[PDB]
């Protein structure tokens, strides 16, 4: 498989290792932050001493090319003792060649086995990071879920990539000493000056790669940004789609997109005017050496001295091809390394089961969000925790498994025991539904079987493709809500563990699931096992089976005791309980979307920059055939314009690149946020979020500089070629059997290449989904006490990645050996031909040219393949399917107030939400009259929330009409129907920002509306007693506030917006029932002259309503008030209602 030495266990050891002592000699003195690149180097740096000492040998190699070249022209020009015979010359440059060629692709070899190594050993020290960083950085907003996937996509690649070109930060430096001194044999004090020029590229390429680093970082900044308000956008589509916020928020990210690419131009600036230095000091440096020896020394070179300077010249000018790549991924990965080390440096995580005494515990802040805990949890026995929103209850299970700030008193577990945690927002694998359960375990049918009956699953699960197989979660078919948390309750309830913390397994189900679940599973199965049981429940009606009943309020626990002591004790408390229940043509793309100006403009100056270069060198050569002022003026022009060239052909290919990018993204952005919501149901969100964050990473700096670099190479090689062949026609004869030698390496490679990529990005989709589903449901890992799988896991997910990408490499050093071999041929036949007249001189000179570019040729073709097959996504994205917003009504007809009544009238309905399935609604007719109050109860599965979503037409309809207020809704635009009705939906969508944002994303409400929307929705105190009020921040996904709090947020959003219909669906699932009652209690008195429908989770709630829909597979069973249907014997909703109370 992998070599023990190329395993990521040893190489992470090593590298922990020597961070470890980094951070012992960090300790030692203040402001000394643990540093990566020395424990880096500590770990792996014997490897690039190595490839260094290689390459240091193949350029003192290289230098033979100059000697050689210089032989040949002398005797051109004019035993044992032969070894100035030219053809024996030519034979020891081809044997240098060869050789040097050798030890540059060991070095390389050397330099990938380490970065792979090393990407191995950083990716299992932030997993290990991930599984010991505390959730509150994630929750108070120090950092993101994305920015962590970032880290492990992009910023351990871009260290990577810069550690196969780390040897070249001294070996370019050396070579170029090196050639200097040379050139002072040949040329004397003249080459000092040229010398002098070409050092001014030191100073310079510091401070362009000071520029570029703060481009660099402000970028990262950004573009992070923008990603976030993308996944957003992505993940609560469905809301903003219902709300018609789409282009608010689209606007948000194109304004952070304009940043970011401000920020890229300014990068690209720079590295454009690193390519002009690189480029253009060459030529300064060989006028001014020239010049001065024409006018120091009064005698011409003899044709020797003149092409080996040149030819050193040539040698001199290959390093500086390469140094503006080498400082572009120097400073993106110093960027890159400085957030890992922010990363890697973090916080951390720090009879009676369980005993918390004198507990004073925080979410960070150091503001104790518990206090004066003392708790018990008797063994084997049923503990309920029950208290209104936002009253510690999940902070108390987080709290005893140590999962925030302990400030005082202590949690005794008579180190931790395992525990079952099922988390109250419900976090499932990407495995099937069977690993999902088992979560593992060693499958046992019978215990299977029981948890899965328990847990009514089975229904479901033989609905799904393949029942138990079926992959699950992201990256697989999306289930409802309930199914969710009933999988969570499964895998709870089947893990052999004595300790299970069930945290509001209720929320998603009806009243027949939940019962079920209750009775069965945790009266019956849970008892038998003997197993202590702990849940998070607002179902006062359950309260019976508890052994032991905790109430909290307001962090504290208010009392604690069975049902008789609270009842003797606190007969308050159970008062109210009981008042309570009542008792290809992609790069042609990329390259034309610059209009055909850039494009051609790009093509016409490199071809003529080359020409001016070329012509340099043939006037260098002419004029020392000599051995005079025209001269000098005439290369002084040349000159001149060969610098301009430079500075002209360094920008356009910089310039496509921002175009394109910017076209790319636009297009993407806009089609997406169009799109059906069937798109988002089937397509999983992780396709359309990678799009984004890595393919528009490689559109935007990962394209440009392999396009300048390949049209660079690919010129210079045709270049070499034409000249060789116009001074020995012969050569072209040499061409073609060489030239089908390099069409067949290409083949080959070609067919292994696809293949062996596929394999990479097939094995790395994995891997980054683990570090994903990991930092997400962190507190469930831990909790089951499982990190050791998991880490065993990632070890053998990143093994076998670091093999598919070793094999990757190594088929590229194949192909590049291969072509270097070719080259080396080519510089032999290339060198007989020319020995068996000026002309010949310089072809023979470009023939060293041809090898050193066909490697970059190669090299830079290959991966402008990938990343035009990354261009290829969005531009297949952009084929999409568009919601038709338009709409046939002339908007004349809509009054300026549409809803002015809210009267609705549905006939014939009928729904279905795909072409070709089943239909869901059947027939629904109703009539809702303005200002009525109707409430629509049933199981889950009956079609409510397709009733609600039909008003929106987010569901396609077959037949039927919906007629609001004497307009048919499927007429009017999307727009003008989702605009004037709200919905307040189950699952709460919030955004990060204020809570300005979340209530108005537009900024035009009166801060007195949100005051009033927020009092109405009972959150009027707790936004009050916030640091900054209505500018409070809310972390991305609202969890920095509970799961009713958000809710409650999401019933505020709806409250202003203070239109005529509002459609409630589910809205209390998880608020308690004090703040439910006083809530509709508000409701109904703020919105009595509105139109209200409100999908019920609690019949209770609709007992005060004018209008009773009860929904049985689609159709509509009972319509009359709920005086009729509660005296009707034996009727549906007297049945659901005598089950809830
Ligand atoms: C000109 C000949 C003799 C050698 C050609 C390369 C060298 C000039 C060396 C010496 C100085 C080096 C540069 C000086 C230091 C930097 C900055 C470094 O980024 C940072 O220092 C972080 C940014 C910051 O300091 O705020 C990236 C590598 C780079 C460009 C180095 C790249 C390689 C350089 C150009
Ligand atoms: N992840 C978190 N990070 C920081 N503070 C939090 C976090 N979760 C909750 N809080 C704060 O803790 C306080 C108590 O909330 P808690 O998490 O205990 O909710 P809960 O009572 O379990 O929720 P509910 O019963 O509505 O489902 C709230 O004021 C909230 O601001
Ligand atoms: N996103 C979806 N895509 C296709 N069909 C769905 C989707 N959601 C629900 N359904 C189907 O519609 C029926 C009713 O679902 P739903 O409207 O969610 O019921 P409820 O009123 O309990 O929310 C179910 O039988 C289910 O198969
Ligand atoms: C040394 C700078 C001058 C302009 C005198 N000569 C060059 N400059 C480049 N580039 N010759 C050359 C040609 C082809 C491939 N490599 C090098
Ligand atoms: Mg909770
Ligand atoms: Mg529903």
């Given at each position: 498989?992998?070599?023990?030495?190329?395993?990521?266990?040893?190489?992470?050891?090593?590298?922990?290792?020597?961070?470890?002592?980094?951070?012992?000699?960090?300790?030692?003195?203040?402001?000394?932050?643990?540093?990566?690149?020395?424990?880096?180097?500590?770990?792996?740096?014997?490897?690039?001493?190595?490839?260094?000492?290689?390459?240091?040998?193949?350029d003192?190699?290289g230098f033979?090319?100059p000697?050689?070249?210089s032989?040949?022209?002398?005797?051109?020009?004019?035993?044992?003792?032969?070894?100035?015979?030219?053809?024996?010359?030519?034979?020891?440059?081809?044997?240098?060649?060869?050789?040097?060629?050798?030890?540059?692709?060991?070095?390389?070899?050397?330099?990938?086995?380490?970065?792979?190594?090393?990407?191995?050993?950083?990716?299992?020290?932030?997993?290990?990071?991930?599984?010991?960083?505390?959730?509150?950085?994630?929750?108070?907003?120090?950092?993101?879920?994305?920015?962590?996937?970032?880290?492990?996509?992009?910023?351990?690649?871009?260290?990577?990539?810069?550690?196969?070109?780390?040897?070249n930060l001294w070996a370019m430096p050396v070579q170029i000493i090196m050639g200097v001194i040379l050139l002072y044999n040949l040329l004397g004090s003249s080459a000092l000056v040229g010398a002098a020029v070409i050092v001014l590229l030191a100073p310079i390429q510091y401070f362009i790669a000071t520029k570029?680093?703060?481009?660099?970082?402000?970028?990262?900044?950004?573009?992070?940004?923008?990603?976030?308000?993308?996944?957003?956008?992505?993940?609560?589509?469905?809301?903003?789609?219902?709300?018609?916020?789409?282009?608010?928020?689209?606007?948000?990210?194109?304004?952070?997109?304009?940043?970011?690419?401000?920020?890229?131009?300014?990068?690209?600036?720079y590295?454009?005017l690193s390519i002009f230095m690189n480029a253009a000091i060459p030529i300064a440096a060989v006028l001014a050496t020239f010049v001065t020896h024409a006018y120091a020394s009064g005698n011409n070179l003899?044709?020797?001295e003149a092409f080996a300077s040149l030819s050193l010249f040539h040698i001199l000018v290959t390093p500086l091809f390469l140094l503006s790549?080498v400082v572009?991924?120097?400073?993106?990965?110093?960027?890159?390394?400085?957030?890992?080390?922010?990363?890697?440096?973090?916080?951390?995580?720090?009879?009676?089961?369980?005993?918390?005494?004198?507990?004073?515990?925080?979410?960070?802040?150091?503001?104790?969000?518990?206090?004066?805990?003392?708790?018990?949890?008797?063994?084997?026995?049923?503990?309920?925790?029950?208290?209104?929103?936002?009253?510690?209850?999940?902070?108390?299970?987080?709290?005893?498994?140590?999962?925030?700030?302990?400030?005082?008193?202590?949690?005794?577990?008579?180190?931790?025991?395992?525990?079952?945690?099922?988390?109250?927002?419900?976090?499932?694998?990407?495995?099937?539904?069977?690993?999902?359960?088992?979560?593992?375990?060693?499958?046992?049918?019978?215990?299977?079987?029981?948890?899965?009956?328990?847990?009514?699953?089975?229904?479901?699960?033989?609905?799904?493709?393949?029942?138990?197989?079926?992959?699950?979660?992201?990256?697989?078919?999306?289930?409802?809500?309930?199914?969710?948390?009933?999988?969570?309750?499964?895998?709870?309830?089947?893990?052999?563990?004595?300790?299970?913390?069930?945290?509001?397994?209720?929320?998603?189900?009806?009243?027949?699931?939940?019962?079920?679940?209750?009775?069965?599973?945790?009266?019956?199965?849970?008892?038998?096992?003997?197993?202590?049981?702990?849940?998070?429940?607002?179902?006062?009606?359950?309260?019976?089976?508890?052994?032991?009943?905790?109430?909290?309020?307001?962090?504290?626990?208010?009392?604690?005791?069975?049902?008789?002591?609270?009842?003797?004790?606190?007969?308050?408390?159970?008062?109210?309980?009981?008042?309570?229940?009542?008792?290809?043509?992609?790069?042609?793309?990329?390259?034309?979307?610059?209009?055909?100006?850039?494009?051609?403009?790009?093509?016409?100056?490199?071809?003529?920059?080359?020409?001016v270069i070329?012509?340099i060198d043939?006037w260098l050569?002419?004029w020392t055939?000599?051995?005079?002022?025209?001269y000098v003026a005439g290369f002084s022009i040349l000159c001149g314009a060969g610098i301009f060239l430079c500075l002209?052909?360094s920008?356009?290919?910089?310039?496509?690149?921002?175009?394109?990018?910017?076209?790319?993204?636009?297009?993407?952005?806009?089609?997406?946020?169009?799109?059906?919501?069937?798109?988002?149901?089937?397509?999983?969100?992780?396709?359309?979020?990678?799009?984004?964050?890595?393919?528009?990473?490689?559109?935007?700096?990962?394209?440009?500089?392999?396009?300048?670099?390949?049209?660079?190479?690919?010129?210079?090689?045709?270049?070499?070629?034409?000249?060789?062949?116009?001074?020995?026609?012969?050569?072209?004869?040499?061409?073609?059997?060489?030239?089908?030698?390099?069409?067949?390496?290409?083949?080959?490679?070609?067919?292994?290449?696809?293949?062996?990529?596929?394999?990479?990005?097939?094995?790395?989709?994995?891997?980054?989904?683990?570090?994903?589903?990991?930092?997400?449901?962190?507190?469930?890992?831990?909790?089951?006490?499982?990190?050791?799988?998991?880490?065993?896991?990632?070890?053998?997910?990143?093994?076998?990645?670091?093999?598919?990408?070793?094999?990757?490499?190594?088929?590229?050093?194949?192909?590049?050996?291969?072509?270097?071999?070719?080259?080396?041929?080519?510089?032999?036949?290339?060198?007989?031909?020319?020995?068996?007249?000026?002309?010949?001189?310089?072809?023979?000179?470009?023939?060293?040219?041809?090898?050193?570019?066909?490697?970059?040729?190669?090299?830079?073709?290959?991966?402008?393949?990938?990343?035009?097959?990354?261009?290829?996504?969005?531009?297949?994205?952009?084929?999409?399917?568009?919601?038709?917003?338009?709409?046939?009504?002339?908007?004349?007809?809509?009054?300026?107030?549409?809803?002015?009544?809210?009267?609705?009238?549905?006939?014939?309905?009928?729904?279905?939400?795909?072409?070709?399935?089943?239909?869901?609604?059947?027939?629904?007719?109703?009539?809702?009259?303005?200002?009525?109050?109707?409430?629509?109860?049933?199981?889950?599965?009956?079609?409510?929330?397709?009733?609600?979503?039909?008003?929106?037409?987010?569901?396609?309809?077959?037949?039927?009409?919906?007629?609001?207020?004497?307009?048919?809704?499927?007429?009017?635009?999307?727009?003008?129907?989702?605009?004037?009705?709200?919905?307040?939906?189950?699952?709460?969508?919030?955004?990060?920002?204020?809570?300005?944002?979340?209530?108005?994303?537009?900024?035009?409400?009166?801060?007195?509306?949100?005051?009033?929307?927020?009092?109405?929705?009972?959150?009027?105190?707790?936004?009050?007693?916030?640091?900054?009020?209505?500018?409070?921040?809310?972390?991305?996904?609202?969890?920095?506030?509970?799961?009713?709090?958000?809710?409650?947020?999401?019933?505020?959003?709806?409250?202003?917006?203070?239109?005529?219909?509002?459609?409630?669906?589910?809205?209390?699932?998880?608020?308690?029932?004090?703040?439910?009652?006083?809530?509709?209690?508000?409701?109904?008195?703020?919105?009595?002259?509105?139109?209200?429908?409100?999908?019920?989770?609690?019949?209770?709630?609709?007992?005060?309503?004018?209008?009773?829909?009860?929904?049985?597979?689609?159709?509509?069973?009972?319509?009359?008030?709920?005086?009729?249907?509660?005296?009707?014997?034996?009727?549906?909703?007297?049945?659901?209602?005598?089950?809830?109370?």
């Amino acid at each position: 498989k992998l070599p023990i030495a190329m395993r990521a266990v040893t190489n992470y050891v090593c590298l922990k290792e020597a961070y470890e002592e980094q951070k012992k000699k960090a300790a030692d003195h203040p402001n000394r932050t643990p540093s990566i690149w020395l424990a880096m180097y500590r770990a792996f740096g014997r490897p690039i001493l190595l490839s260094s000492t290689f390459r240091y040998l193949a350029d003192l190699l290289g230098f033979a090319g100059p000697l050689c070249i210089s032989g040949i022209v002398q005797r051109v020009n004019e035993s044992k003792e032969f070894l100035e015979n030219a053809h024996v010359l030519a034979v020891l440059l081809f044997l240098a060649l060869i050789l040097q060629r050798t030890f540059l692709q060991a070095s390389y070899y050397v330099t990938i086995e380490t970065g792979i190594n090393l990407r191995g050993a950083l990716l299992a020290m932030i997993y290990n990071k991930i599984l010991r960083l505390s959730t509150s950085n994630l929750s108070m907003g120090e950092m993101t879920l994305g920015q962590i996937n970032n880290l492990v996509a992009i910023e351990t690649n871009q260290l990577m990539w810069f550690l196969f070109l780390c040897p070249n930060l001294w070996a370019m430096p050396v070579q170029i000493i090196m050639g200097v001194i040379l050139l002072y044999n040949l040329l004397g004090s003249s080459a000092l000056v040229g010398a002098a020029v070409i050092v001014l590229l030191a100073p310079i390429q510091y401070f362009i790669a000071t520029k570029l680093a703060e481009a660099q970082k402000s970028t990262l900044d950004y573009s992070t940004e923008r990603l976030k308000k993308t996944n957003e956008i992505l993940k609560g589509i469905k809301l903003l789609k219902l709300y018609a916020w789409e282009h608010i928020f689209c606007k948000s990210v194109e304004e952070t997109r304009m940043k970011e690419l401000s920020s890229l131009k300014t990068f690209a600036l720079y590295t454009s005017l690193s390519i002009f230095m690189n480029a253009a000091i060459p030529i300064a440096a060989v006028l001014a050496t020239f010049v001065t020896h024409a006018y120091a020394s009064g005698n011409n070179l003899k044709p020797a001295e003149a092409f080996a300077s040149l030819s050193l010249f040539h040698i001199l000018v290959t390093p500086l091809f390469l140094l503006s790549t080498v400082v572009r991924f120097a400073v993106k990965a110093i960027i890159s390394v400085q957030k890992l080390n922010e990363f890697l440096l973090s916080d951390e995580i720090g009879d009676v089961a369980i005993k918390v005494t004198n507990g004073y515990f925080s979410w960070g802040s150091g503001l104790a969000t518990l206090s004066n805990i003392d708790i018990r949890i008797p063994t084997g026995q049923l503990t309920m925790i029950v208290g209104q929103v936002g009253c510690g209850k999940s902070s108390l299970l987080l709290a005893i498994l140590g999962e925030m700030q302990t400030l005082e008193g202590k949690v005794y577990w008579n180190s931790r025991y395992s525990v079952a945690y099922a988390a109250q927002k419900p976090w499932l694998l990407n495995a099937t539904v069977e690993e999902n359960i088992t979560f593992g375990s060693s499958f046992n049918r019978q215990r299977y079987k029981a948890v899965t009956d328990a847990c009514s699953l089975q229904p479901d699960i033989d609905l799904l493709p393949f029942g138990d197989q079926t992959e699950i979660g992201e990256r697989g078919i999306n289930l409802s809500g309930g199914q969710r948390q009933r999988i969570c309750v499964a895998r709870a309830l089947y893990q052999n563990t004595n300790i299970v913390f069930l945290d509001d397994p209720f929320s998603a189900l009806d009243i027949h699931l939940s019962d079920h679940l209750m009775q069965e599973g945790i009266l019956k199965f849970l008892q038998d096992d003997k197993r202590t049981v702990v849940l998070v429940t607002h179902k006062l009606q359950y309260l019976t089976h508890a052994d032991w009943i905790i109430a909290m309020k307001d962090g504290s626990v208010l009392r604690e005791g069975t049902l008789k002591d609270i009842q003797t004790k606190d007969v308050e408390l159970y008062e109210h309980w009981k008042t309570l229940m009542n008792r290809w043509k992609t790069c042609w793309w990329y390259l034309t979307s610059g209009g055909f100006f850039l494009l051609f403009l790009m093509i016409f100056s490199k071809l003529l920059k080359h020409s001016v270069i070329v012509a340099i060198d043939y006037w260098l050569a002419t004029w020392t055939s000599e051995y005079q002022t025209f001269y000098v003026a005439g290369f002084s022009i040349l000159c001149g314009a060969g610098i301009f060239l430079c500075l002209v052909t360094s920008l356009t290919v910089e310039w496509m690149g921002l175009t394109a990018a910017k076209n790319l993204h636009h297009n993407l952005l806009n089609k997406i946020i169009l799109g059906p919501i069937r798109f988002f149901d089937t397509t999983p969100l992780g396709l359309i979020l990678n799009r984004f964050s890595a393919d528009t990473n490689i559109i935007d700096q990962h394209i440009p500089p392999t396009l300048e670099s390949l049209t660079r190479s690919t010129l210079l090689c045709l270049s070499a070629i034409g000249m060789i062949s116009y001074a020995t026609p012969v050569f072209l004869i040499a061409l073609a059997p060489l030239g089908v030698a390099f069409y067949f390496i290409q083949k080959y490679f070609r067919v292994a290449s696809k293949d062996l990529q596929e394999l990479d990005d097939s094995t790395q989709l994995p891997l980054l989904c683990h570090f994903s589903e990991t930092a997400e449901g962190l507190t469930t890992i831990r909790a089951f006490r499982h990190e050791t799988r998991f880490k065993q896991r990632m070890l053998e997910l990143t093994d076998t990645n670091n093999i598919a990408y070793l094999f990757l490499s190594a088929a590229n050093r194949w192909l590049e050996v291969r072509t270097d071999y070719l080259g080396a041929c080519i510089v032999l036949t290339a060198s007989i031909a020319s020995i068996s007249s000026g002309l010949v001189g310089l072809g023979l000179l470009y023939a060293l040219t041809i090898t050193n570019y066909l490697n970059w040729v190669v090299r830079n073709l290959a991966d402008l393949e990938v990343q035009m097959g990354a261009v290829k996504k969005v531009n297949s994205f952009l084929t999409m399917e568009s919601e038709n917003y338009e709409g046939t009504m002339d908007p004349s007809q809509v009054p300026e107030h549409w809803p002015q009544e809210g009267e609705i009238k549905i006939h014939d309905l009928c729904v279905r939400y795909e072409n070709n399935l089943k239909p869901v609604l059947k027939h629904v007719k109703a009539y809702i009259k303005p200002g009525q109050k109707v409430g629509i109860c049933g199981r889950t599965g009956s079609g409510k929330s397709s009733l609600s979503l039909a008003f929106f037409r987010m569901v396609d309809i077959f037949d039927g009409k919906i007629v609001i207020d004497g307009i048919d809704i499927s007429k009017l635009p999307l727009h003008t129907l989702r605009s004037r009705l709200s919905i307040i939906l189950q699952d709460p969508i919030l955004f990060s920002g204020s809570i300005r944002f979340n209530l108005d994303p537009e900024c035009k409400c009166t801060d007195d509306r949100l005051w009033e929307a927020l009092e109405i929705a009972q959150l009027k105190n707790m936004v009050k007693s916030l640091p900054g009020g209505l500018d409070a921040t809310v972390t991305e996904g609202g969890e920095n506030f509970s799961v009713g709090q958000r809710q409650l947020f999401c019933l505020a959003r709806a409250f202003v917006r203070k239109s005529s219909i509002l459609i409630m669906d589910e809205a209390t699932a998880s608020i308690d029932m004090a703040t439910e009652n006083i809530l509709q209690k508000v409701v109904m008195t703020a919105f009595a002259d509105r139109t209200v429908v409100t999908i019920a989770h609690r019949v209770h709630t609709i007992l005060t309503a004018d209008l009773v829909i009860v929904m049985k597979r689609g159709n509509i069973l009972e319509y009359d008030t709920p005086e009729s249907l509660l005296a009707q014997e034996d009727g549906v909703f007297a049945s659901f209602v005598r089950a809830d109370m």
